[PDB]
């Protein structure tokens, strides 16, 4: 059954710290503990070791990433920006 209506993973915090602080924690903790697709072997086996470190249990490859998600929006933009500036320079 649906055990909690809205607190979700932050049910471990009970009634403490305030609802806004627990709700802000819930957004990032779900991402923190989620399984991600490996871009190397194609399996959903990427988990966080520590902040900025993401390991694949299958192919044993570690990639540097965000604090709570594998990739941040700024890093994604840089790849396109660095991709773009690369060919505009090599041509």
């Amino acid at each position: 059954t649906k055990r909690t209506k809205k607190v979700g993973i932050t049910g471990k915090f009970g009634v403490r710290y305030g609802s806004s602080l627990r709700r802000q924690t819930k957004k990032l903790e779900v991402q923190q503990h989620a399984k991600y697709d490996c871009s190397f072997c194609g399996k959903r086996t990427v988990q966080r070791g520590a902040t900025g470190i993401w390991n694949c249990k299958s192919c044993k490859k570690t990639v540097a990433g965000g604090a709570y998600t594998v990739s941040t929006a700024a890093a994604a933009t840089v790849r396109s920006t660095i991709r773009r500036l690369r060919e505009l320079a090599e041509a």
């Binding site: 915090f13 710290y17 602080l21 627990r22 802000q24 924690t25 990032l28 903790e29 190397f40 070791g49 520590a50 902040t51 900025g52 470190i53 490859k61 570690t62 990639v63 540097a64 990433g65 965000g66 604090a67 709570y68 998600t69 990739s71 941040t72 700024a74 890093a75 840089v78 790849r79 920006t81 660095i82 500036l85 690369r86 505009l88 320079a89």
Partner: protein, 249 residues
């Protein structure tokens, strides 16, 4: 009165940094012939957690140009760098994430990290998780590059100064609240002894310029002159203004 906590920090007795578990200093390679004239290739062996640091570090192996020997390097890992990746460092390095290039070889708008202030100091700028340096423009006649620092400041640096392409990994730490005194305890347990912080107004007059009184209050302006002496600089030192910031800056 008495020597205040501000003053006691500088003697460095109980206030030295806690460095037993740290994984080595994060630096670029020394400028050598290979990086001055061409490039050198290394391989990422590990991406590791450094206690006291929000950003992960990369251990990268290079051949020694002059004798049969391996060299391990401790870099600040940019986001997207992975174990087994080849890292190219030098003047001829391609414009890819993780490569170490001089700032003169990067076009306008390149995002770069662990940037040197002076040529060959192995990195000073944009080193924390989620931070980076933007290249604003070039001054090829003067061999100077203009960059945008994480704080918003703009700075002219030598075009021979190096930097690492990409954004420092581990970004977004501060988005999640700490929620607990204990999380702060564990945070500073591997940094230094700066937590918890007793308020100056909660002390007696011997302890702090803010102490004493039959109510807790400061009693004089908390904005202190830059020319004040040690023991007086508690509060907002040389503040150009105070109060809630409204509008833009």
């Amino acid at each position: 009165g008495r020597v205040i906590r501000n003053q006691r920090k500088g003697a460095g007795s109980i206030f030295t940094s806690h460095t037993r578990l740290r994984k080595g200093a994060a630096k670029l390679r020394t400028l050598d012939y290979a990086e001055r004239h061409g490039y050198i290739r290394g391989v990422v062996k590990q991406i590791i957690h450094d206690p006291g640091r929000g950003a992960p570090l990369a251990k990268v192996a290079f051949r020694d140009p002059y004798k049969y020997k391996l060299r391990e390097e401790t870099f600040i890992a940019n986001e997207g760098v992975y174990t087994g990746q080849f890292i190219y460092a030098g003047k001829k390095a391609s414009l890819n994430v993780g490569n170490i290039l001089p700032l003169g070889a990067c076009p306008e708008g390149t995002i770069v990290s662990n940037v040197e202030e002076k040529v060959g100091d192995r990195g000073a700028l944009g080193r924390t998780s989620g931070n980076y340096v933007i290249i604003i423009g070039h001054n090829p006649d003067e061999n100077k590059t203009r960059v945008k620092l994480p704080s918003g400041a703009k700075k002219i640096i030598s075009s021979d100064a190096r930097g690492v392409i990409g954004v420092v990994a581990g970004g977004g730490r501060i988005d999640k609240p700490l929620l607990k005194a204990g999380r702060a305890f564990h945070k500073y347990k591997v940094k230094r002894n700066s937590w918890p912080k007793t308020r100056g107004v909660a002390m007696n007059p011997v302890d702090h310029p803010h102490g004493g009184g039959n109510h807790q209050h400061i009693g004089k302006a908390s904005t202190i002159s830059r020319g004040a002496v040690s023991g007086q600089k508690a509060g907002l030192i040389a503040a150009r203004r105070t109060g809630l910031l409204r509008g833009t800056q």
